[PDB]
Design an enzyme around this catalytic site. Structure first.
Site, PDB file in Angstrom:
ATOM      1  N   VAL A  23     118.074 101.922 -56.466  1.00 17.40           N
ATOM      2  CA  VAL A  23     116.785 102.605 -56.332  1.00 17.40           C
ATOM      3  C   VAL A  23     115.610 101.838 -56.958  1.00 17.40           C
ATOM      4  CG1 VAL A  23     117.911 104.838 -56.144  1.00 17.40           C
ATOM      5  CG2 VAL A  23     117.233 103.981 -58.416  1.00 17.40           C
ATOM      6  N   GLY A  24     115.894 100.699 -57.576  1.00 20.88           N
ATOM      7  CA  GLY A  24     114.870  99.894 -58.222  1.00 20.88           C
ATOM      8  C   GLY A  24     115.442  98.528 -58.563  1.00 20.88           C
ATOM      9  N   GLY A  26     113.783  94.487 -59.903  1.00 22.86           N
ATOM     10  CA  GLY A  26     112.598  93.743 -60.330  1.00 22.86           C
ATOM     11  C   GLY A  26     112.944  92.652 -61.318  1.00 22.86           C
ATOM     12  N   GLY A  29     115.410  93.577 -63.976  1.00 22.95           N
ATOM     13  CA  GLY A  29     116.783  93.985 -63.649  1.00 22.95           C
ATOM     14  C   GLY A  29     116.818  95.032 -62.546  1.00 22.95           C
ATOM     15  N   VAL A  31     117.909  99.278 -61.260  1.00 23.88           N
ATOM     16  CA  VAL A  31     118.333 100.651 -61.492  1.00 23.88           C
ATOM     17  C   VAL A  31     119.081 101.148 -60.264  1.00 23.88           C
ATOM     18  CG1 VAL A  31     117.673 103.021 -62.071  1.00 23.88           C
ATOM     19  CG2 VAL A  31     116.451 101.100 -63.105  1.00 23.88           C
ATOM     20  N   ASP A 145     105.408 101.104 -74.560  1.00 25.70           N
ATOM     21  CA  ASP A 145     105.232 100.772 -73.131  1.00 25.70           C
ATOM     22  C   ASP A 145     105.197 102.031 -72.252  1.00 25.70           C
ATOM     23  OD1 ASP A 145     104.777  99.051 -70.949  1.00 25.70           O
ATOM     24  OD2 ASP A 145     106.919  98.617 -70.711  1.00 25.70           O
TER      25      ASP A 145
HETATM   26  C1  LIG Z   1     112.040 103.620 -65.615  1.00 27.23           C
HETATM   27  O1  LIG Z   1     113.196 103.594 -66.461  1.00 27.23           O
HETATM   28  C2  LIG Z   1     114.362 104.072 -66.056  1.00 27.23           C
HETATM   29  C3  LIG Z   1     114.470 105.021 -65.031  1.00 27.23           C
HETATM   30  C4  LIG Z   1     115.783 105.523 -64.614  1.00 27.23           C
HETATM   31  C5  LIG Z   1     115.859 106.438 -63.601  1.00 27.23           C
HETATM   32  C6  LIG Z   1     115.216 106.171 -62.412  1.00 27.23           C
HETATM   33  C7  LIG Z   1     115.296 107.086 -61.344  1.00 27.23           C
HETATM   34  C8  LIG Z   1     114.653 106.869 -60.150  1.00 27.23           C
HETATM   35  C9  LIG Z   1     115.259 107.182 -58.960  1.00 27.23           C
HETATM   36  C10 LIG Z   1     114.563 106.983 -57.707  1.00 27.23           C
HETATM   37  C11 LIG Z   1     113.323 106.494 -57.693  1.00 27.23           C
HETATM   38  C12 LIG Z   1     112.667 106.170 -58.936  1.00 27.23           C
HETATM   39  O2  LIG Z   1     111.354 105.667 -58.920  1.00 27.23           O
HETATM   40  C13 LIG Z   1     113.332 106.358 -60.131  1.00 27.23           C
HETATM   41  C14 LIG Z   1     116.037 108.288 -61.544  1.00 27.23           C
HETATM   42  N1  LIG Z   1     116.657 108.536 -62.708  1.00 27.23           N
HETATM   43  C15 LIG Z   1     116.606 107.668 -63.732  1.00 27.23           C
HETATM   44  N2  LIG Z   1     117.313 108.035 -64.955  1.00 27.23           N
HETATM   45  C16 LIG Z   1     116.940 105.046 -65.247  1.00 27.23           C
HETATM   46  C17 LIG Z   1     116.837 104.080 -66.308  1.00 27.23           C
HETATM   47  O3  LIG Z   1     117.955 103.572 -66.982  1.00 27.23           O
HETATM   48  C18 LIG Z   1     119.243 103.990 -66.660  1.00 27.23           C
HETATM   49  C19 LIG Z   1     115.532 103.601 -66.684  1.00 27.23           C
HETATM   50  O4  LIG Z   1     115.406 102.642 -67.723  1.00 27.23           O
HETATM   51  C20 LIG Z   1     115.540 103.063 -68.985  1.00 27.23           C
END
Ligand SMILES: COc1cc(-c2cc(-c3cccc(O)c3)cnc2N)cc(OC)c1OC
EC number: 2.7.11.30
Length: 312
Positions: A23-24, A26, A29, A31, A145
């Site tokens: 789903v991410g 960059g 890294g 996600v 941040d």
């Molecule tokens: C931004 O930092 C993080 C975010 C998510 C995260 C992302 C989404 C998601 C899903 C779809 C679209 C979208 O933009 C985000 C959902 N649940 C989550 N927990 C997980 C992370 O570490 C595991 C993370 O770094 C710490």
């Protein structure tokens, strides 16, 4: 111990997770949405450019009791060695509506939903900032941040703050400051004036809290633009959209924020709405150049709760 599972159990859960879809991706890294026993979890794999954030975030969640409905629920962290390389994993709750950044681009808000969003962010940030004594508690924590991409929208309309890789900690036990070591800097677009002109007091913990308040004012702005009042609403835009490029430089931002003294413009239609008027006043009090004149997270929490209670 800490915020999630016991340490051996963290290894077990991580090895058993399947990655379903990404789903991410960059420079930082990746996600992924993943699954443990038919339950969605979020899996972050850190790039080699940002390994020190894995260490900091993992050490934090495992040595501190950080459980709160507005802080991303940590489950587990692991190191693996997939193939001719090693991998650093962070596992958390999965929030299917995704980042506030994505969410604001796809939906508009009413008064209740806007306030539920900004009030939940304030609660999370105040919980980080505030020390809890006794063996149950926690040190004071500043994020460093904060931005709309690091806030997730949960199913109930509330949000949670994510990404503690740049966090600093403080206790009144020692008055000692734990800054760690991470070459990573905040997102330039959200950098406070004292950071951009290198006057920030780096041995004072309050300094880092006040950087979060700067960045929280900017997120307040991003959200308020999407609250409808009298049939009128703004398009989603990032802070300082009209004066810097995408991916702005340090110098770009220093010119805009320090030299030219620019701040986000307040749409004039906000003044016909009592809630938007109040949020505009809050924003201003997050944007003082003098870091010491900015409101605290707790004050913002109490003020939003008061605004919440005036809703008819
Ligand atoms: C931004 O930092 C993080 C975010 C998510 C995260 C992302 C989404 C998601 C899903 C779809 C679209 C979208 O933009 C985000 C959902 N649940 C989550 N927990 C997980 C992370 O570490 C595991 C993370 O770094 C710490």
């Amino acid at each position: 111990s800490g915020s999630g599972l016991p340490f051996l159990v963290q290894r077990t859960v991580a090895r058993e997770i399947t990655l379903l879809e990404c789903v991410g991706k960059g420079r930082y890294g990746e996600v992924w949405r993943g699954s443990w026993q038919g339950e969605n979890v979020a899996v972050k794999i850190f790039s080699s450019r940002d390994e020190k954030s894995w260490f900091r975030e993992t050490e934090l969640y495992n040595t501190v009791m950080l459980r709160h409905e507005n802080i991303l629920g940590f489950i587990a962290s692991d190191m693996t060695s997939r193939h001719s390389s090693t991998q650093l994993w962070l596992i958390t709750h999965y929030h299917e509506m995704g980042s506030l950044y994505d969410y604001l681009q796809l939906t508009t808000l009413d008064t209740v939903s806007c306030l539920r969003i900004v009030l939940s962010i304030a609660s999370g940030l105040a919980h980080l900032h505030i020390e809890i004594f006794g063996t149950q508690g926690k040190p004071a924590i500043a994020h460093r941040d904060l931005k709309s991409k690091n806030i997730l929208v949960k199913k109930n309309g509330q949000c949670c703050i994510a990404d503690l890789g740049l966090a600093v900690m403080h206790s009144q036990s020692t008055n000692q400051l734990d800054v760690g070591n991470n070459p990573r800097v905040g997102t330039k677009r959200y950098m406070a004036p004292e950071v951009l002109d290198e006057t920030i007091q780096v041995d004072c913990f309050d300094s880092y809290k006040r950087v979060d308040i700067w960045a929280f004012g900017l997120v307040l702005w991003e959200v308020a633009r999407r609250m409808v009042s009298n049939g009128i609403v703004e398009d989603y835009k990032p802070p300082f959209y009209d004066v810097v490029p995408n991916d702005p430089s340090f110098e770009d931002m220093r010119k805009v924020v320090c030299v030219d003294q620019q701040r986000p413009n307040i749409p004039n239609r906000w003044f016909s709405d009592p809630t938007l008027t109040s949020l505009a006043k809050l924003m201003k009090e997050c944007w003082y150049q003098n870091p010491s004149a900015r409101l605290t997270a707790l004050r913002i929490k109490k003020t939003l709760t008061k605004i919440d209670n005036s809703l008819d």
